C-alpha cells in the first residue's frame, strides 16, 4: 500500500515523481518531511493587535 | 498537515514583483512607526517604478526540516582493546547535543524543539604505535549499549550488565556500513527545551539551566573480541540527524563562543567587525590603485 | 533468492541522505503534542523580522551601544555625508551579525529585495529632510549628494511618522548572489545625505541619533546549505 | 594627460599593461617568424605642451633560407630562389641510386635567421 | 530581382543592388527580454530609435595580402551616439544586431571574404604561458588584424589566421552564422544576430558577446584595372536594446 | 529478509552504465532554464553543415590559407587534371579535420551520401566548364578525362550560380564503412578535369581559385562511440 | 519533451533514397550560391538516377545525450597514509573539467551546456616501497568532502573541518564498489559556460576567460584510519558522466593541443596532414608494386 | 507507480520492452535520456530569411 508524490524539479523548465513504501512499524523510522513548505511570518513580523494597513500613517 | 509523514506536495514560491508606475497621492507606505513593534511590509513596487517579474524562486532549503535534517557529529571518544586501566577499555558519555558547537548553535536558534532522531555511528580503529608491530587480529566487533536513566552501569568490559536483556544494544563488525537507528521523541515534556531560566530545587537553588532538564541516560561502547596481542585503539563518533521536526520561539543565533557544556556562559564579545569610518566604502572600479 | 546488483554508493554514509531506519524503541508512546505559541517553519520567517544594524561599527564602538547610533546634527553640514555602506548582507561587518546576516551565513546563495528602515530619535521639536540613496554596482560610491540622487532614492521628511523605509530592489545580472560576495556578484551601496539640514528650536539638543533596521522582503530566498564561519571550538566538553 | 593611441605593428603585438597616461610604458614584440627592428618599448612623456611617446613603433620583418644543399647523386626538384618560412625543397636520386632519409626539408627560423630543417637525404648506388 | 534590398532602422536606411540573402542568427530574430526570463527587477529603458539604428565603423583596406580583421562587439560601439551613452550609464544591457558588411569591386576583380559572427570568441595568447590584454583583444572601432604568421609578444592575441586566434581550423568557422562575399557575385553580407549568452542580460564593457571576423579565403586580384583601392566597410545596428541598473557613468 | 543472488557484474564500474544514484544535494532548486538560440541535439546537425576542405594540403601550405585553394587557369591545360582525392571522410588528410571529419573521428562506423560543393572565385568575366567525377572502388584512379567520365559525374558550367554540388551517393557492399577505412571498406575517389578550358577577356586575371566544401546528406549516420586520435596530453593541469 | 526523464520513444530514422529517373528541364538543384551562407540540400536523387532504398539506419548514438553520457576521468591525485609533510596526508583540487583533455574537448564542442552529473570515484592504494615490508594494516576507509565556495578549508588530516556537519561527505572502505552520486545543475547562471570572451573586472582587466565564471568549490579527500606503520599511498580518480543534457551554439572541435587549464592558449598548428600533390591518389589494385 | 517503454531493437528484424521505477526524490538522480531522438539541422544548415527552394537558381 504505497504512495506516489512528485519530485523536486531539477535541470529543465510524468517521470517527475517517485514512489515510496514504509517498511517499519513506528513513525519514527520514516524518512524526513523535506517536502512540506508552509509559512507564517506574521507571528513575528507584525504581532500587533489593531491591523496596520501601512499605506496610511501608522499613528496620527 | 501531519509532521510525521515522509511525503507532502506544494511549491514554496516567493512573491512576484508587481508592475508599478508613477504616483502622486496621500499614500505614504514608505513612512511607518517602528515603535509599534511591527516590521514594515513594503516591497520594491511601493517606492520605485518596477517592471513585472514572474518569480519562480522557492524557499525549500530554508524550511526547518531541511535546515536541521543533516547528520552532525555530536560526540567522539576512544577506548582500547587492551590496557592496564580497565577504564580505558570502554567509552561512555551522557547523551546531549551540547558538546560540539556546530549542531548546538543550529538547535539553539529555537527555544523548544520536538523531533525524532536518526543516530548513525562511525567507528574506526588504529593499531597503536610500538616496537613490535606484527600480529594477525581478526575483525573487531563492537557493542554500543544505551542505558536509560536508572539502569545498572557497566564497571568493566566484562560486567554482567552487557547482557542487555532489556537495554537496547547494537553489535557491529568493522568493514561494514556504519550502524544506524531511529529514536522517537523521547522527552518527559511536550518538547525538548534548549534553554531553561530555572532551577532544579524549589528553593531557587541547586543546578541552574539546561542541565536540570536533561537526563536522557548514557551510552557505553566496548570491543567484544576483547584482546589483541598488541595494543590497539578505537574511536567512536556519533551523529544526530533530527527528522520530523517542530520548533518554537526563535531567538538570536549565539554570538559569543561557548565556554562549556553545562552553561550558557560567555565572555564579552564584539557586536561585529570594525571598519574605518561610518562612510567608508572601498573603491573597486579603478584602473587598479 | 531474488537476483540483485549493488550499485556504487552501497554502504556509504552520506550526511544528507534520507532513508528509513529501524527504531530502537518499538512502539514507544511519545508524549502528546502541546500547542506552544510562536511556531517557526522556515528560517526566512526570522530573516523577515527587523533587527538593528550596527552601522557605526567603528573602532572603539565594537562593545558599546554606539555602534547602533548614526550621529546627525543641527547647523550646516550638507557637504558632509551622513553614512554609507556596501550592500553585502552576509559579508560586510555592518550586516553579517544581523538577524538577516546570521541566517544568510548558513547558506551560500541569496536573492531578493531588502528593507532598510530608518528611525529618527531626536526630540519632537526637531526637524529635517534626508536623502537615502542606493546605487547599483558599476561605479564607485557617490561622493556628493549630486551623484547620489542619480540613483534609487527616497527623500525622508522627519515628522510624526518617526520611521522611513528605503527598499533596495533586486537588480542583478544573475538570479542569485554569493553570500560570500565577490565583485562578480556586487550589489552596490547605500549612502545618506542631508537634503535640507536639521533645524531645531531653542532649548532642545542640537544633535541626535538615527537608527537603522534591516529585514528581508517577500521575494527573498536562500540556497545551498553550508556551515557558519562564526562558531568554533578547540576541543570537546564544548 | 594621456598619450595618443599606440596604434598597431604589422606582424607584431603591442602590450599595454598600465594604461596610456603619462609615465606609462608599453611593450612591443613581433609574431613568431618575424624579427624586431627598432625599439621594444615606449614611454609616455610630457614634453613642453605635448604628451607623447618616447619611441616610435618598430618594424617586424620576415626571411629567406639560403640556397638548399646539393646532395651527391641526386637532384633538387624544381630548384628556385627565395625559399621563405615553411616552404620546402624536395629531392630525388638519379638513375642508379636509391634514397634513404627524408625526401623533403623545410625552411625554418632559428634565432631570427632562416635555416633548413632536418638533414637532407642521401643517394646510394 | 532578389539581389535588390533595403533596410530601415531609426533614422537610417541601407540599400544594395547585389545582395545574396540575409542570414538570421540560429534562426532567431532579436526579441526584448520576457517577464518569465528576467531577474533584474527594475524598469528597463528602451531608447528605441535613438539607439537602434545604423552606426558605420571606420573602413579598412583590402590589400592583395590582407590576412583578415576582427572586432569585439558590444565594445566597439561604445562611442557610438546614444547607444554608447546608455552603455556607460547602465550596469546591465542587452541587444541584438543587424550587421551589414559592404565591399564592391568590378566584374574584372576577384576575391572571396568569409564574414562571420562568432559568439563568445575567447582568444589565445601569443606567449603561450602568458595572458592577453584588453588591447590585444579589441581596439573599439578600427579593428584588430589577423596575421599570416605566428605572432609573439606578451598580451597580444596569437593571430595567425589559420587558427582564428581560437585554436581551431579557420575553415571550420562556418558552424557560426555567416555569409561569403565573392566579388564575382556579391557585394555585401547581412547577418542579423540575436542576443546569445548564458544569462538574460550582462554588462557591456566586461563581456564581448561576440566577434565579427572578415577573413579573405581567396585573395584580392586584378590587372591594369586602375582600381587597386578596394575598401571594406562595416555598418551595424543594435536591435531591441534595453538597459537596467542605472547609476553614474563608468570610468573610461 | 527477501532472498537474493548476486549476478556476475555486481560491484563493477562500467563507464557506459546507466543507473539511478542518490543525490548529494537533496531538494536543490536548480536555476530556471533560459531559451538560448542555437540548441544542438544530434552531432549530425553539425556534420550536415558545410565546412571548407583543405584540398591543397601539400607540403608548405599546411599553415597558410592556400591549402584551401584549388588553382585553375586560362589557356590549354586539358591533359592536366585539376585535382583528385580519396573518399575517406574520417581518415585522409583532406577530410579528417573537416567539420564532418572531426565528428566521424569520435565513432568507428559511418554510412551515407556526401555533398561536395565547389565554388568558383574568379572574376565575373571569367568563364568555363569542369567535369567533376566520382569513381566507386575496384579500379585505380582515372588517369584521363576519358576514364573519369565513365563514372558518376556532373559537368559544371561557371555562371551567375557560383557554386556546383557533386553528390557522392552511397554505393557499398556493406551498410557501413570503418571511419578508420581499410581496403575492404574502400569508397573510391573523385577527380576533376577541364571539360572545356577557362576563357577570359583582356584585363582580367588569367588564373583563379576554386574552393571545396563538404557536408553530410540526410541519409548519413554514425555508430560505435570511441575516443579521438586527435587530442592528447603528457600530464595533468592539462 | 521534458529533458529530465529516464524514458521517451521514437526511432531516429535517416532518409529513404527516393527512386529517380532521367530529366531534361530548367531544374538546376546541383547549382546553388554558397555566398548566401546556406548549405545545399541536394541528395543523390537530384544528380544521378537512383533506385529506391528503404533505409532503417538511425542516429541514436549521435544524440547529444549519448555522446556525452559516459563517465570520463577528469582528475587524479595522491595522498599518503603517513608522512612528515602533513600536506601530503590529503588531496585537494578545484572542481573543473579542464584538466583532462578527452572530456574537455568533448564539452568544448558546445559553447553552453546544462546538465546533471553522475560522479563516480575510483580509489586505490599501494604499499610504498621500502626495506621492511611486513605489516598487517586493516582495511583503509577514506573520506571525500566537498567544500562549496566559502566554506572553511581543512588544514591537516585532523582539522575540525572534517566534521562535515553540513558539507556533503562520502565515507567509503576499500574492496567495495566505487562510490557514486548525482549532482544537480549547479550553476549561478542558466547554463554552464564553456567559453567567456570577457573579464572579471568592469574595467576590462583582471582575469580573462573561463576562470572568472568557474567557482564551484573544491574537493578534499583523506584517509580516516589515519596511520599505517609503514608508508602507503593512495590515488583518487574522479569521473564525470553528464546526464539530462542540453547544449547550445556548437563550435569547431579544438584543433591545436591544449597548453594549460586556465586558458584557451595554443601554439600555431597545421590545418591537416600533407600529401604529395593535389592529385595524389595512391594506387591500390595492382599485382602488388 | 511505474513506467513501461520499449527497448532499442537488437539482433533480429512484446518482450521488447522494459519497466522502470524511480526511487529518488530528485530528478538529478534519474538515469540518462538515451531514448530522446529529435533533430533540427535548419538552425545551422539554412539560417537564411527568404526561403531557398534550390531546384531554382538561388540568385538571378
Range F1-238 has CATH code 3.30.930.10: no
**What is the distance in angstroms between the Cα of F24 and the nearest Cα belonging to chain G?**
6
User: What are the distances in angstroms from CA F187 to CA F153, G275, H35?
Assistant: 15, 19, 32
Query: Roughly how many angstroms between the first and final C-alpha of chain H, as a whole number?
Result: 62
Q: What kind and span of H or E run contains B44?
A: helix B44-47
Distance, in angstroms, between G195 CA and closest chain A CA? 20
- The alpha carbon torsion through F190, F191, F195, F201 (nearest 10 deg) reads 110
Among residues C8, C52, C161, C178, the alpha carbon closest in space to that of C108 is found at C178
Residue F106 zone, left/alpha/beta (φ > 0; ψ -120 to 50; rest):
alpha
Helix (H) or strand (E) holding G47: helix G44-47
Place of cell 617586424: D60
Establish, for the pair of chains B and E, how many residue pairs have beta carbons separated by less than 8 Å.
Answer: 25
The whole-angstrom distance between residue D7's C-alpha and the CA centroid of its chain comes to 21
Closest-CA residue to G115 (of G264, G263, G242)? G242
Helical H segments across G109-259, by residue range: 210-213
Give me the torsion for CA of G269, G271, G276, G281, rounded to 10°: 140
Residue of G nearest to H8 (CA): G11
The residue of C9, C17, C223 whose CB has the most chain G CBs within 10 angstroms, and thus the best one to mutate to test that interface, is C9
Q: How far apart are the first and last CA of chain C?
A: 49
Query: Given CB atoms, is G197 within the 8 Å cutoff of chain E?
Result: yes
Q: What is the chain B residue with the closest CA to G167?
A: B70
CA distance linking residue B251 with residue D106, whole number of Å: 80
Residue pair G164/B100 in contact (Cβ under 8 Å)? The answer is: no
Concatenate the DSSP letters of all residues of C44-71 into one string.
HHHHTS-EE--TT-BTT-TTSGGGG-EE
Strands in chain G per DSSP E: 31-32, 72-80, 90-94, 110-127, 141-147, 169-173, 180-183, 192-193, 218-223, 232-250
Which residue do the cell numbers 537526563 mark? B215
Judged by a CB distance cut-off of 8 A, whether residue B124 touches chain G is yes
Number of structural domains found in chain E: 1
- For G253, the grid coordinates are 572541435
Give how far Cα C142 sits from Cα of A6, C151, C211, E86, H6, Å: 50, 9, 22, 19, 65
Expressed in angstroms, the distance from the first to the final Cα of chain B is 58
Phi, psi of D16, deg, nearest 5: -130, 80
Subunits close to B (at least 3 CB pairs below 8 A): A, C, E, F, G
Question: H24 to chain A: nearest residue by CA?
Answer: A18
Using CA atoms, how far residue C200 sits from B110, C122, C126, C205, in Å, is 45, 10, 5, 8
Long-range contacts, stretch C35-38, CB < 8 angstroms, 24+ apart: C36/B112, C36/B190, C36/B191, C36/B248, C36/B249, C37/A43, C37/B248, C37/B249, C38/A43, C38/A44, C38/B111, C38/B248, C38/B249, C38/B250
Q: Which residues of D20-46 are buried (b: 16+ CB within 10 A; e: fewer)?
A: beeebebbbbbbbbbbbeeeeebebee
CA–CA distance, G81 with G138 (Å, rounded to integer): 13
Q: B21: nearest CA in chain E?
A: E43
CB contact under 8 A, B58 and F29: yes
Q: CA of F235 to nearest chain H CA: how many angstroms apart?
A: 31
Q: Where are the domains of chain C?
A: 1-238
Q: Do B66 and F29 touch (CB under 8 A)?
A: no
CB distance from H49 to chain E under 8 Å? Answer: yes
Q: In degrees rounded to 5, what are phi and psi of residue C194? A: -70, 130
Nearest chain B Cα distance for residue G188, angstroms: 13
Q: What is the CA radius of gyration of chain A?
A: 21
Tell me how far apart the alpha carbons of residues C191 and B219 are, in angstroms, rounded to a whole number. Answer: 57
- The answer to whether the CB of F90 falls within 8 A of the CB of F104 is yes
In the Cβ-directed half-sphere of B24, how many Cα atoms lie within 13 Å? 0
* Residue in the block written with cell 519632537: C124
Query: Measured between alpha carbons, how far is residue H7 from residues B65, E152, G126, H10 in Å?
Result: 40, 56, 42, 9
Under 8 Å between Cβ of C180 and G149: yes
For chain B, say whether G279 makes contact (Cβ under 8 Å): no
Residue E213 contacts residue E95 (beta carbons within 8 Å): no
User: Which residues touch E50 (CB under 8 Å, ≥6 apart)?
Assistant: E10, E81, E82
Alpha-carbon distance values, D62 to B41, D84, D86, E100, E148 (Å): 72, 8, 12, 35, 11
Q: What are the distances in angstroms from CA E186 to CA F125, H48, H51?
A: 14, 16, 18
- Domain count of the fold of chain B: 1
* C contacts of F14 (beta carbons < 8 Å): none
How remote is the C-alpha of F133 from its chain's centroid?
Answer: 17
B223: part of which helix (H) or strand (E)? strand B218-223
- Report which of F64, F194, F215 is spatially closest to residue F120, judged by C-alpha positions: F194
Q: Which candidate from E35, E43, E250 shows the least CB-CB separation from B54? A: E35
Alpha-carbon distance F16 to nearest alpha carbon in chain E (angstroms): 29
Residues of B in contact with A26 (CB under 8 A): 182, 184
CB G231 within 8 A of CB G99: no
CB contact under 8 A, A7 and H27: yes
Place of cell 550499485: C7
Q: Are the Cβ atoms of C107 and B105 closer than 8 angstroms? A: no
Q: What is the CATH number of the domain that holds G220?
A: 2.60.120.20
Cell of C234: 578547540
The torsion angles phi and psi of G32, rounded to 5 degrees, stand at -130, -175
Q: Cα–Cα distance between D122 and D72 in angstroms, integer?
A: 7
Can chain D be said to touch chain A, i.e. do they have 3 or more Cβ pairs within 8 angstroms?
no
* CB atoms near residue B26 (< 10 Å): 7
Distance from CA of G59 to the nearest CA of H (A): 8
Neighbours of E77 (CB within 10 A): 22
Q: Using a CB-CB distance cutoff of 8 angstroms, which residues of chain E are in contact with residue C137?
A: 91, 245, 247
Contact C62 B274 (CB under 8 A): yes
CA angle A52/A53/A59 to nearest 5° reads 55
- Among candidates G166, G205, G225 on the partner chain, residue whose Cβ is nearest the Cβ of B124: G225
CB atoms within 10 A of CB G10: 12
CA distances from B250 to B223, C37, C47, C227, E42 (A): 42, 11, 11, 19, 34
Contacts of E129 in chain G (CB under 8 A): 259-260, 265
Q: Say yes or no for a CB contact (<8 Å) between D13 and E144.
A: no
- How far from E172 is each of F49, F190, G251, CA to CA, in Å? 10, 22, 8
Collect all residues of chain F within an 8 Å Cβ-Cβ radius of residue E182. Answer: 119, 121, 162
C-alpha G256/C-alpha G264 separation (Å) is 10
3-state secondary structure chain A: CCEEEECECCCCCCCCEEEECCCCCCHHHCCCCCCCCCCCHHHCCCCCCCCCCCCCCCCC
Kindly give the pairing relationship between strand B218-223 and strand C163-168.
Answer: unpaired
Three-class SS state of G167: coil
Chain D residue with Cα closest to F62:
D86
Q: Which of B56, B57, B66 sits opposite F27 (nearest CB)?
A: B66
Partner residues linked to G171 by β-bridges: G143
The CA-CA-CA angle for residues G56, G60, G66, to 5°, reads: 165
Q: What are phi and psi of E161, to 5 degrees?
A: -40, -45
**Distance between CA atoms of E202 and G197, rounded to whole angstroms?**
13
Give the DSSP H or E segment for B45: helix B44-47
Neighboring chains of E (3 or more beta-carbon pairs < 8 A):
B, C, D, F, G, H
Nearest Cβ partner for B39 among A28, A38, A45: A45
Give the cell for residue G193: 559556460
- DSSP code of C191? E
Residue closest to F204 by CA, chosen among F128, F118, F117, F129: F128
**Which H or E run contains D122?**
strand D122-124
Interface probe for D, chosen from E135, E138, E141, E160 (most Cβ of D below 10 Å), is E135
How determined? cryo-EM
Cell of E154: 606578451
Q: Which residue of B has its CA nearest to A55?
A: B29
How far is C173 from chain E, CA to nearest CA, in Å?
A: 6
Please give the span between the terminal C-alpha atoms of chain E, in angstroms, as a whole number: 47
What's the rounded Cα separation, in Å, for the pair G14 and G1?
21
Query: Which of C6, C8, C221 to probe by mutation at the F interface, max F CB count within 10 Å?
Result: C8
Chain A residue with minimum CA distance to G191: A11
Rounded-to-integer distance, Cα C51 and Cα F154, Å: 82
Q: What residues in H contact G183, CB-CB < 8 Å?
A: 28
C-alpha cell at D46: 610630457
Burial F183-220 (b: 16+ CB within 10 A, else e): eebbbbbbbbbbbebbebeeebbeebbbbbbbbbbbbb
In terms of DSSP H, where are the helices of F86-151? 93-96, 99-104, 145-148
CA distance A58 to chain F (A): 38
Resolution of the entry in angstroms: 16.0
Which residue does chain C place closest to G182, by CA atoms? C9
Hey, is E29 helix, strand or coil? coil
Among all residues of chain E, which has the CA nearest to that of G202? E206
Q: Which domain holds residue G240?
A: 1-289
The b/e string for D92-113 (b: 16+ C-beta within 10 A; e otherwise) is: ebeeebebeeebbbbbbbeeee
Residue F230 CA to residue F98 CA, distance in Å, equals 12
Amino acid at each position: 500500500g504505497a504512495q506516489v508524490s512528485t519530485q523536486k524539479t531539477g535541470a529543465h523548465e510524468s517521470i517527475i515523481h517517485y514512489t515510496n513504501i514504509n517498511y517499519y512499524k513506528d513513525a519514527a523510522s520514516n524518512s524526513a518531511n523535506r517536502q512540506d513548505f508552509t509559512q507564517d511570518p506574521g507571528k513575528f513580523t507584525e504581532p500587533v493587535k489593531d491591523i496596520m494597513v501601512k499605506s496610511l500613517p501608522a499613528l496620527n | 498537515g501531519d509532521v510525521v509523514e515522509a511525503v507532502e506536495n506544494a511549491v514554496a514560491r516567493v512573491a512576484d514583483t508587481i508592475g508599478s508606475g508613477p504616483s502622486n497621492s496621500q499614500a505614504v507606505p514608505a513612512l511607518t512607526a517602528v515603535e509599534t513593534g511591527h516590521t514594515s511590509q513594503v516591497t520594491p513596487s511601493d517606492t520605485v517604478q518596477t517592471r513585472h517579474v514572474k518569480n519562480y524562486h522557492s524557499r525549500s532549503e530554508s524550511s526547518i526540516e531541511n535546515f536541521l535534517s543533516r547528520s552532525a557529529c555530536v560526540y567522539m571518544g576512544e577506548y582500547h582493546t587492551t590496557n592496564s586501566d580497565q577504564t580505558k577499555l570502554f567509552a561512555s558519555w551522557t547523551i546531549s547535543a551540547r558538546r560540539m558547537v556546530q549542531m548546538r548553535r543550529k538547535l539553539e536558534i529555537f527555544t523548544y524543539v520536538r523531533f525524532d532522531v536518526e543516530v548513525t555511528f562511525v567507528i574506526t580503529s588504529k593499531q597503536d604505535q610500538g616496537t613490535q608491530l606484527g600480529q594477525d587480529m581478526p575483525p573487531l566487533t563492537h557493542q554500543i549499549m544505551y542505558i536509560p536513566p536508572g539502569g545498572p552501569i557497566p564497571k568493566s568490559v566484562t560486567d554482567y550488565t552487557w547482557q542487555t536483556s532489556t537495554n537496547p544494544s547494537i553489535f557491529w563488525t568493522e568493514g561494514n556500513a556504519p550502524p544506524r537507528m531511529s529514536i522517537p521523541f523521547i522527552s518527559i515534556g511536550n518538547a525538548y527545551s534548549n534553554f531553561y531560566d530555572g532551577w532544579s530545587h524549589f528553593s531557587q537553588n541547586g543546578v541552574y539551566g539546561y542541565n536540570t532538564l536533561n537526563h536522557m541516560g548514557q551510552i557505553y561502547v566496548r570491543h567484544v573480541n576483547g584482546s589483541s596481542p598488541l595494543p590497539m585503539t578505537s574511536t567512536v563518533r556519533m551523529y544526530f540527524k533530527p527528522k520530523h521536526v517542530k520548533a518554537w520561539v526563535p531567538r538570536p543565533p549565539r554570538l559569543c563562543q561557548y565556554k562549556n557544556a553545562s552553561t550558557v556562559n560567555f565572555s564579552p564579545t564584539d557586536i561585529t567587525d570594525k571598519r574605518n569610518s561610518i562612510t567608508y566604502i572601498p573603491d573597486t572600479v579603478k584602473p587598479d590603485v | 533468492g531474488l537476483p540483485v546488483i549493488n550499485t556504487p554508493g552501497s554502504n556509504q554514509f552520506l550526511t544528507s541522505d534520507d532513508f528509513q531506519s529501524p527504531s530502537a524503541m518499538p512502539q514507544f508512546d511519545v508524549t502528546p503534542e502541546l500547542n506552544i505559541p510562536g511556531e517557526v517553519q522556515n528560517l526566512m520567517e526570522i530573516a523577515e523580522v527587523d533587527s538593528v544594524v550596527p552601522v557605526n561599527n567603528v573602532a572603539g564602538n565594537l562593545e558599546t551601544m554606539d555602534i547602533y547610533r548614526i550621529p546627525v546634527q543641527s547647523g550646516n553640514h550638507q557637504s558632509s555625508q551622513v553614512f554609507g555602506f556596501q550592500v553585502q548582507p552576509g559579508l560586510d561587518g555592518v550586516f553579517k551579525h544581523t538577524l538577516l546576516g546570521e541566517i544568510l551565513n548558513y547558506y551560500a546563495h541569496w536573492s531578493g529585495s531588502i528593507k532598510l528602515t530608518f528611525v529618527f530619535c531626536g526630540s519632537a521639536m526637531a526637524t529635517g529632510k534626508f536623502l537615502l540613496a542606493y546605487a547599483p554596482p558599476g561605479a564607485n560610491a557617490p561622493k556628493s549628494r549630486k551623484d547620489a540622487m542619480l540613483g534609487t532614492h527616497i527623500i525622508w521628511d522627519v515628522g510624526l511618522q518617526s520611521s522611513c523605509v528605503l527598499c533596495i530592489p533586486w537588480i542583478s545580472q544573475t538570479h542569485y548572489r554569493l553570500v560570500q560576495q565577490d565583485e562578480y556578484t556586487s550589489a552596490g551601496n547605500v549612502t545618506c545625505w542631508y537634503q535640507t539640514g536639521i533645524v531645531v528650536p531653542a532649548g532642545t539638543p542640537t544633535s541626535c541619533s538615527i537608527m537603522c533596521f534591516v529585514s528581508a522582503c517577500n521575494d527573498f530566498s536562500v540556497r545551498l546549505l553550508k556551515d557558519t564561519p562564526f562558531i568554533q571550538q578547540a576541543a570537546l566538553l564544548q | 594627460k594621456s598619450c595618443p593611441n599606440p596604434g598597431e605593428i604589422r606582424n607584431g603585438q603591442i602590450d599595454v599593461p598600465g594604461g596610456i597616461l603619462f609615465g606609462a610604458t608599453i611593450s612591443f614584440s613581433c609574431n613568431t617568424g618575424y624579427k624586431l627592428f627598432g625599439s621594444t618599448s615606449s614611454f609616455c612623456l610630457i614634453s613642453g605642451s605635448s604628451v607623447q611617446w618616447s619611441d616610435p613603433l618598430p618594424e617586424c620583418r620576415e626571411i629567406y633560407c639560403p640556397a638548399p644543399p646539393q646532395i651527391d647523386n641526386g637532384i633538387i626538384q624544381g630548384e628556385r630562389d627565395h625559399y621563405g618560412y615553411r616552404q620546402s625543397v624536395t629531392y630525388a636520386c638519379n638513375k642508379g641510386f636509391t634514397m634513404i632519409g627524408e625526401h623533403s626539408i623545410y625552411c625554418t627560423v632559428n634565432n631570427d635567421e632562416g635555416e633548413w630543417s632536418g638533414p637532407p637525404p642521401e643517394c646510394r648506388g | 530581382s532578389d539581389r535588390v534590398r533595403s533596410i530601415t532602422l531609426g533614422n537610417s536606411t541601407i540599400t544594395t543592388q547585389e545582395s545574396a540573402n540575409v542570414v538570421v542568427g540560429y534562426g532567431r530574430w532579436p526579441e526584448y527580454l520576457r517577464d518569465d526570463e528576467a531577474t533584474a527587477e527594475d524598469q528597463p529603458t528602451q531608447p528605441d530609435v535613438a539607439t537602434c539604428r545604423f552606426y558605420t565603423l571606420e573602413s579598412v583596406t583590402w590589400e592583395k595580402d590582407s590576412p583578415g580583421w576582427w572586432w569585439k562587439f558590444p565594445d566597439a560601439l561604445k562611442d557610438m551616439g546614444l547607444f554608447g551613452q546608455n552603455m556607460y550609464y547602465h550596469y546591465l544591457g542587452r541587444a541584438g544586431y543587424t550587421i551589414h558588411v559592404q565591399c564592391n569591386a568590378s566584374k574584372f576583380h576577384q576575391g572571396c571574404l568569409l564574414v562571420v559572427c562568432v559568439p563568445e570568441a575567447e582568444m589565445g595568447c601569443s606567449t603561450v604561458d602568458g595572458t592577453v590584454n584588453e588591447h590585444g583583444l579589441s581596439e573599439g572601432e578600427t579593428a584588430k588584424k589577423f596575421s599570416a604568421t605566428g605572432t609573439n609578444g606578451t598580451n597580444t592575441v596569437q593571430s595567425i589566421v589559420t587558427n582564428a586566434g581560437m585554436g581551431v581550423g579557420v575553415g571550420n568557422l562556418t558552424i557560426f552564422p555567416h555569409q561569403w562575399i565573392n566579388l564575382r557575385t556579391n557585394n555585401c553580407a547581412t547577418i542579423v544576430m540575436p542576443y546569445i549568452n548564458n544569462v538574460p542580460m550582462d554588462n557591456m564593457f566586461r563581456h564581448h558577446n561576440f566577434t565579427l571576423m572578415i577573413i579573405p579565403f581567396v585573395p584580392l586580384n586584378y590587372s591594369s584595372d586602375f582600381s587597386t583601392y578596394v575598401p571594406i566597410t562595416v555598418t551595424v545596428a543594435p536591435m531591441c536594446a534595453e538597459y537596467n541598473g542605472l547609476r553614474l557613468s563608468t570610468a573610461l
